[PDB]
């Protein structure tokens, strides 16, 4: 019957915050503006975006792929609308096949996938020097920059390493809704049980731990709220009652505890290792282990 | 041993069973009535996992598993060395979980603080018995819930679901993998924005709550809030489990057949399922 | 490389999943040992330093450079004993060590248990130009844009009565949340009620934690417009105090 | 020996004797089910052998 | 409400045995909470799959 | 003059008696019952 | 012995009580389950 | 003359006799146990 | 060496007779399921074949 | 003489020889098994 | 040399003999283990082939 | 001439005469299982 | 320095050092010796 | 509180209780009315 904090029980606004100086260039921000329905969870401020040459890069070659893969499903369905809608998570932007190798392939026969994969490329990179160089005018500590390049560096080995090992841009996930999920099915079975790939097994504990983290951490938090324990740099700087409680009661529970600070740590790392061995595990596939049910028979965690 | 700001929080009070019979601390650990009945279940469980280990004749730790009684048996409780054993670990492992929440409760309640972790922990408590309990019941026998071994599970985990092919195709389960990604990259984000606003470039200051919402605004547009981003976490947690927990309960239960064959309605529609030309011709 | 062995059966993914485990066990010393920053060395229940302390060493010192010039060392003995209450009303129920201490005087009072408060700098909470975080809403030109406004709502206590009733709100300016509510009690005096620790219904303001009698004692801000740390930690303290006594 | 009654001055009866009520009953259930799960020393099957009604 | 303390000065033997029975009383009770939660779950779980189609109870066994 | 439980040696007493004439009738019982299952189904 | 009843010194008898019917009642429970698993002494 | 538990040297004395009365029933009920399995099944 | 008392003045005799008790509680759990799951050094399964059980 | 615990030498002399005391209780009893099980079922 | 008692001027004592007795434990088992999944060194498979219990 | 435990000199000859001690008593142990492990089965 | 240590503190560890890591390579050397009569590698 | 918590468990009790009818083909009585009646 208590007030769990979930929503906010009433709402504040006056002028939207438009941000500090630093060392950005302010002539990059846009205009701000309110949403009150974000307000009741969160912040119902739509603030100023920057928009520099990273983020320009950035959206324009995002664009370039998105509108590359629906023009590629428009032609698949023959310029029909109602074909469009009808088949719109059965369309695929598929690789060139085994035979073209890592060469660049005809339009019809992979050549449009090269390009969607090379714009899709520049964007990432752009906005991974976005992530970075926002950070940097701020005289921020760069950790999601970091953060990023092990997501950054599972989807690359998914289509651009794996690919240059393999021999051939065939083994990359096509683009489309239902036919990646038919690539990933696929992958397990032809590398044998992918399930037995002790990288994706740790990749799978760093997501149930990443869930399990959060929940732990947020459900912390929220219950310390009464003491202001959602200000958590100050309480770094100026410890409270409240990292005092959180602490106290995860090592009464479990015997030991975190502080403030090193949660994130834990956190960071914990969300970081899922797409860190999950880029090893993907990368091994293939190039050293083509079987990993064997492999696992071999090496004593699979029955004989 | 104590921590330093420790000695005024230990006070009597807040138990639910017992009064001051068990309010006391071993070591660190807080143990109350459901303490001393999570140490009971926990430790028995341990032990008749590693008496079924004895019983199977392997002693390597990720080849021990321990079945459930076969599906021909029901609901009938099994003989141990014909799955009652699984049965018998099955119900110390939720009395050890259901333990192990009230003496959150516990704890919660000697400190002043909310409930919210006893919940969330409650919600996975759900999903455990989702997966040993209601289902198999719903399917008429305790031999379709899942073994206690670390790869054999994962056996039972691929057989289930290419009972129904590609099991990818749940819409259900589609929903939960977006919200457990979504959770992770949430994760990252705020564990990230902490800690680069905590250790700033050397030279500068300690950074401001302003520098977060400054620096997401910038990179995307938008900020949640430090509670924003709490409420935020806890709750794509909580729903990407009860999701899975949905998907796993409609399946085999209400629904046999393969789900990427369940998602032809949308194409089979009278009014376009003829329209020559595209996939589905 | 498939099938190439350095030796025996120990490939690439062999070579892999044991660099793993090593990194693994690096980083788990790593991260626990950043997280023995405070609350450390261990002490008995005499407040003497305990026998035992643990396998993992306390970190190297490390320094926060504040925005006013003041610099913060977290695992120092002046972080320590700047956050160390003194005089604390409690008793040893047992000469063996894990047992509970047992409030002498009034718990809330005393703030002890769950009325427990942090000697926290006795300075409010800035934002990134140096005005004050927290600030009553007359004193912004903020206004309500979404729920029920409370001021003027009547203000009823876990007993059913009615103490007072609300007057202003006080808002956290760069977050644009309201964390505390004013209220004006019926001898006149005016104390600060913390939002997470109320319901905000149709017709009144609902405080469950603490009943009639306990309103007047609510710690008080020396100043009626600024709220410093030391005083958010002792209201919190005292109202989140009264779910237990 | 004779001086073993001054384990009562190390450590505190209450939390000892909840101890080994735990350890004491969690025992003497691991060795039934031990028996139970062998058939030769089930003897609930024993006697189902022995007298023949199922 | 349900566990009370004795009033062992100024109680009678009559008396002291009707409170160890309450408190016994109570205390089964309590364990009796989790043993009929338990057998509710697992009984109303049967049910609920009896209630379902047929294809409910013939699926390929997942070993 | 050891007391954990701020119970005096002779309240303990008076009570360990009932407790123990509790202890005795619960016995009985349960030996009336095994005694009947015993002659209904032995399991020696 | 004479001297069990100095275990009310010990620990207080009514918290004692209600413990102790947690774990009779659990305990009886259990012994029934068991009893469910060979058809012999299946009472159902 | 160390004491950790605040207990004298009489009461430990007091405590461990009373003790030892409990384990000495518990281990001779264990015996007659063991003795009347021995005689029903031997396992030797 | 006569000197080992002195262990007493680094290591807390409580602490160190709980890792005690656990230790030698685990081991020797430990090594009798060794043996249990070895039928040449099952006890029960030499019983069986001796006395004719099953 | 250095002392972590904050007991003292006699102190600890005391209880050492109640501890050796009662470890060799301990390995007397299970030398006694070990000869019995060597005599019934040698494992060398 | 005479003069390694001054490693004790540097380490201290009680987490030095925790670590000590733990790595110890875990050498100890982990030859245990290296022998007994050697067929040619496990004492029981021997003892099993020289007393034919199996 | 540091100290970062804190010990003296002498204090650290004392603990190291003892722990020397207990390390021969434990090599000395070790050394006669190796010489019986040899005579019962040699492994060179 | 950033360990505190002075000069001489540093020159008596460094000593001690180097007379416990001579005493480890002269076992290793014997060892090696012994393994190379036993069953050489080269 | 109490009248809307006996509101929701009276109609799930009954829709629970009719549904049990409806899947028994013995009291179904729109099974009874088509076989009584030829439909
Ligand atoms: C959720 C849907 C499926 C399932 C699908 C998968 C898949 C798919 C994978 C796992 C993996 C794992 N699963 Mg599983 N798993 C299920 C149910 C369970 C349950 C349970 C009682 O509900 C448990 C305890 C486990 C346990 C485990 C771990 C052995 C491993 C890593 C999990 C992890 O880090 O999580 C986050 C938790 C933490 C980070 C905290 C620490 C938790 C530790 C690691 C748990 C150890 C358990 C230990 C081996 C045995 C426990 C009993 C002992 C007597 C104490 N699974 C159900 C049936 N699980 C992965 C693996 O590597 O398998 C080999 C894997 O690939
Ligand atoms: C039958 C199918 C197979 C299988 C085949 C695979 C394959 C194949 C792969 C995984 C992968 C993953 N699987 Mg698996 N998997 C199976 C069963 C399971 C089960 C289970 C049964 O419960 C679980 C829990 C998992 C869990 C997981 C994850 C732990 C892992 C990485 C997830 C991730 O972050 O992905 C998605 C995250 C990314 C792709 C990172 C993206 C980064 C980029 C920079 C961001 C997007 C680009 C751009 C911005 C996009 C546009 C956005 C605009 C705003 C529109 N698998 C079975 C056995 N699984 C992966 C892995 O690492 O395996 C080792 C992988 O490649
Ligand atoms: C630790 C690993 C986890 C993680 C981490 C992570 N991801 C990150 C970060 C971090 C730490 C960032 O810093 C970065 C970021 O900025 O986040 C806000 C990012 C990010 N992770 C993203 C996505 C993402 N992360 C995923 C996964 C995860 N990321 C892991 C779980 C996934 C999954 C599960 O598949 C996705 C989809 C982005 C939100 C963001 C990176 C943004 C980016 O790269 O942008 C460049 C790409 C484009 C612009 C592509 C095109 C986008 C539109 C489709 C363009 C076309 C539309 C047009 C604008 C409008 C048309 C309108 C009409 C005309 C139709
Ligand atoms: C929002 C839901 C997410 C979540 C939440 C969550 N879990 C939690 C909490 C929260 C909020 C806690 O407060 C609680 C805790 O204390 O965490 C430190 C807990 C916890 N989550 C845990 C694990 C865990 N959570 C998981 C998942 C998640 N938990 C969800 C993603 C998983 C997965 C996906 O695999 C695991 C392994 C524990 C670390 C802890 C609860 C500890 C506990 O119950 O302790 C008492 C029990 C024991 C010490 C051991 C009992 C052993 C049994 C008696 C025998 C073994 C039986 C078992 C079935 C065998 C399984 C074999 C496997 C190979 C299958
Ligand atoms: C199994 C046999 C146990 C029988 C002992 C019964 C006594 C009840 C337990 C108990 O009293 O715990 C207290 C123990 C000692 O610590 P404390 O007494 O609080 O203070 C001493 C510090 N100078 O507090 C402790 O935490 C014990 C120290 C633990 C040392 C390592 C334990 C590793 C194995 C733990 C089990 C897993
Ligand atoms: C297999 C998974 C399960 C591992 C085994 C159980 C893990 C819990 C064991 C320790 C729990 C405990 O008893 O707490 C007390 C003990 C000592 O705590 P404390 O004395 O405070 O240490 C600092 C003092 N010098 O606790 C400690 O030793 C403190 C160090 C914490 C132990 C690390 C356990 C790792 C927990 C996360 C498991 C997954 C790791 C993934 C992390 C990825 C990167 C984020
Ligand atoms: C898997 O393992 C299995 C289950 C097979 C075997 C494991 C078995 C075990 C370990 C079973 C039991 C262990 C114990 C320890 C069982 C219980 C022992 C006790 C101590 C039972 C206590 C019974 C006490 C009872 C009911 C209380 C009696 C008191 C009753 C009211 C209150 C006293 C008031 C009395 C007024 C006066 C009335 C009596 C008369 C004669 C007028
Ligand atoms: C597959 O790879 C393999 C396993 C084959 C490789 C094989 C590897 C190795 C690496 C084997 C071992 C290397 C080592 C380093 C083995 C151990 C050497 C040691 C260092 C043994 C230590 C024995 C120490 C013992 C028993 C402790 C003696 C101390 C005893 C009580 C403590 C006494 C000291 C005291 C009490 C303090 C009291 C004094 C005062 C003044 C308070
Ligand atoms: C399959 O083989 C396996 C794996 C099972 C082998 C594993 C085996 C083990 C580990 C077996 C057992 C090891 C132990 C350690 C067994 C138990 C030994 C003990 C120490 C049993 C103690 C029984 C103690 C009993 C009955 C005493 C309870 C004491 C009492 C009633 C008296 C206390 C009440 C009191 C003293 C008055 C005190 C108060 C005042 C005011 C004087
Ligand atoms: C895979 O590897 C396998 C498992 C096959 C083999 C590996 C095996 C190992 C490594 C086995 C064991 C190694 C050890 C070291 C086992 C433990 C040996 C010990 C050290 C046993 C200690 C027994 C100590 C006992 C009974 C003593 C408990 C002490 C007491 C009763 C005495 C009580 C002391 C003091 C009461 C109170 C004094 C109080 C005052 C006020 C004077
Ligand atoms: C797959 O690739 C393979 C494995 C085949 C080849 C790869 C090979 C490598 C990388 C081999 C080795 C590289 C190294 C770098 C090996 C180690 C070289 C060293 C540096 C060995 C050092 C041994 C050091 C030893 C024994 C010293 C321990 C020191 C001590 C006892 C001295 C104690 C110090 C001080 C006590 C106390 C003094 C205090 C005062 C106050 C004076
Ligand atoms: C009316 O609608 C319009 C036409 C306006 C737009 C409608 C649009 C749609 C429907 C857009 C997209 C639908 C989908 C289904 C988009 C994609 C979803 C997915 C699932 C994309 C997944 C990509 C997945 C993975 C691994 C890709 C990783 C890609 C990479 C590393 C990129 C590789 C980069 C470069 C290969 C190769 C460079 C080499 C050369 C020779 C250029
Ligand atoms: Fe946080």
């Not at chain 1, 809704?177 to 790939?197: A, C, K, P």
């Not at chain 3, 892999?16 to 980083?27: D, P």
């Not at chain 3, 005499?46 to 010039?69: H, I, R, W």
Request: glycine letters at 10%; a negative charge.
């Amino acid at each position: 019957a208590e007030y769990q904090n979930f929503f906010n029980q009433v709402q504040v606004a006056g002028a939207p915050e438009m941000g500090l100086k630093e060392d950005v260039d302010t002539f990059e921000r846009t205009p701000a503006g309110m949403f009150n329905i974000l307000g009741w969870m969160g912040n119902a401020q739509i603030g100023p975006i920057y928009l520099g040459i990273a983020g320009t890069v950035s959206l324009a070659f995002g664009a370039a792929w998105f509108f590359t893969i629906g023009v590629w499903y428009w032609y698949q369905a023959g310029f029909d609308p109602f074909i469009f809608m009808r088949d719109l998570f059965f369309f695929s932007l598929e690789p060139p096949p085994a035979e073209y190798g890592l060469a660049i392939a005809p339009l019809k026969q992979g050549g449009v996938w090269q390009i969607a994969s090379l714009f899709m490329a520049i964007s990432v990179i752009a906005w991974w020097v976005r992530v970075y160089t926002r950070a940097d005018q701020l005289g921020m500590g760069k950790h999601m920059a970091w953060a990023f390049l092990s997501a950054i560096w599972l989807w690359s080995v998914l289509g651009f390493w794996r690919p240059i090992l393999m021999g051939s841009w065939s083994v990359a996930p096509p683009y489309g809704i239902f036919s990646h999920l038919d690539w990933t099915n696929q992958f397990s079975l032809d590398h044998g049980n992918l399930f037995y790939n002790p990288f994706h097994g740790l990749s799978i504990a760093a997501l149930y731990g990443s869930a399990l983290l959060f929940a732990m951490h947020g459900a912390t938090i929220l219950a310390v709220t009464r003491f202001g324990g959602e200000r958590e740099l100050e309480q770094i700087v100026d410890r409270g009652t409240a990292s005092e409680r959180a602490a106290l009661f995860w090592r009464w529970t479990m015997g030991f505890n975190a502080t403030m600070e090193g949660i994130h740590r834990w956190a960071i790392w914990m969300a970081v290792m899922v797409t860190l061995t999950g880029g090893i595990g993907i990368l091994l596939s293939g190039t050293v282990v083509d079987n990993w049910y064997v492999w696992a028979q071999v090496h004593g965690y699979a029955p004989v | 041993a104590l921590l330093s700001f420790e000695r005024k929080y230990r006070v009597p009070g807040g138990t639910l069973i017992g009064g001051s019979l068990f309010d006391f601390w071993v070591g660190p650990f807080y143990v109350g009535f459901f303490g001393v009945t999570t140490i009971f279940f926990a430790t028995l469980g341990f032990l008749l996992i590693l008496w079924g280990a004895a019983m199977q004749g392997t002693w390597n730790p990720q080849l021990i598993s321990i079945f459930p009684p076969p599906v021909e048996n029901g609901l009938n409780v099994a003989a141990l060395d014909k799955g009652g054993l699984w049965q018998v670990i099955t119900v110390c492992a939720t009395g050890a979980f259901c333990s192990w929440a009230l003496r959150e409760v516990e704890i919660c309640r000697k400190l002043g603080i909310g409930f919210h972790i006893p919940v969330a922990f409650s919600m996975a408590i759900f999903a455990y018995l989702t997966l040993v309990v209601i289902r198999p019941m719903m399917m008429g026998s305790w031999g379709y819930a899942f073994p206690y071994g670390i790869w054999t599970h994962l056996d039972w985990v691929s057989n289930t679901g290419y009972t129904y092919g590609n099991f990818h195709y749940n819409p259900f389960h589609m929903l939960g993998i977006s919200l457990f990604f979504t959770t992770a990259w949430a994760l990252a984000m705020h564990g990230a924005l902490v800690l680069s606003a905590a250790n700033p470039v050397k030279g500068k200051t300690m950074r401001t709550p302003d520098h977060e919402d400054t620096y997401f605004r910038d990179l995307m547009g938008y900020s949640v809030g430090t509670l924003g981003i709490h409420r935020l976490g806890l709750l794509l947690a909580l729903n990407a489990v009860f999701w899975s927990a949905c998907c796993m309960l409609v399946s085999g239960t209400i629904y046999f057949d393969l789900w990427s064959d369940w998602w032809y309605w949308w194409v089979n529609m009278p009014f376009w399922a003829d329209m020559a030309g595209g996939i589905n011709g | 490389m498939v099938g190439v062995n350095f030796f025996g059966d120990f490939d690439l993914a062999s070579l892999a999943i044991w660099s793993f485990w090593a990194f693994l066990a690096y980083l788990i010393y790593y991260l626990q040992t950043e997280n023995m920053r405070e609350g450390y060395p261990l002490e008995n229940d005499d407040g003497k330093l305990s026998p035992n302390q643990g396998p993992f060493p306390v970190p190297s010192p490390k320094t926060f450079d504040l925005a006013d010039g003041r610099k913060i060392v977290v695992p120092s003995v002046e972080n320590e004993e700047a956050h160390r209450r003194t005089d604390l009303a409690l008793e040893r129920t047992s000469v063996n060590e894990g047992y509970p201490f047992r409030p002498t005087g009034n718990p809330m009072l005393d703030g002890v248990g769950p009325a427990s408060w942090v000697p926290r700098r006795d300075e409010p909470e800035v934002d990134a130009h140096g005005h004050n975080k927290i600030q009553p809403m007359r004193k912004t030109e903020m206004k309500v844009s979404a729920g029920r406004d409370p001021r003027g709502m009547p203000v009823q206590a876990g007993d059913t009565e009615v103490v007072g009733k609300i007057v202003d709100m006080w808002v956290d300016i760069p977050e644009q949340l309201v964390r505390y509510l004013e209220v004006e009690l019926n001898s006149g005096k005016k104390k600060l009620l913390p939002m997470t620790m109320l319901k905000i219904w149709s017709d009144r303001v609902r405080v469950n934690a603490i009943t009639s009698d306990l309103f007047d004692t609510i710690p008080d801000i020396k100043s009626p417009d600024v709220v410093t740390k030391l005083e958010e930690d002792k209201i919190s303290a005292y109202v989140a105090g009264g779910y237990m006594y | 020996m004779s001086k073993f009654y001054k384990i009562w001055l190390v450590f505190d009866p209450r939390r000892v004797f909840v101890a080994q009520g735990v350890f004491l009953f969690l025992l003497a259930v691991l060795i039934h089910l031990i028996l139970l799960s062998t058939p030769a020393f089930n003897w609930l099957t024993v006697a189902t052998a022995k007298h023949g009604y199922v | 409400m349900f566990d009370k303390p004795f009033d062992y000065e100024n109680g009678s033997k009559f008396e002291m045995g009707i409170w160890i029975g309450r408190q016994m009383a109570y205390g089964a009770f309590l364990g009796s909470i989790p043993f009929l939660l338990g057998l509710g779950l697992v009984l109303g779980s049967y049910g609920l799959g009896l209630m379902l189609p047929e294809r409910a109870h013939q699926a390929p066994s997942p070993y | 003059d050891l007391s954990f439980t701020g119970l005096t040696d002779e309240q303990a007493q008076e009570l360990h008696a009932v407790y123990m004439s509790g202890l005795s009738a619960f016995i009985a019982v349960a030996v009336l019952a095994h005694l009947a299952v015993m002659i209904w189904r032995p399991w020696f």
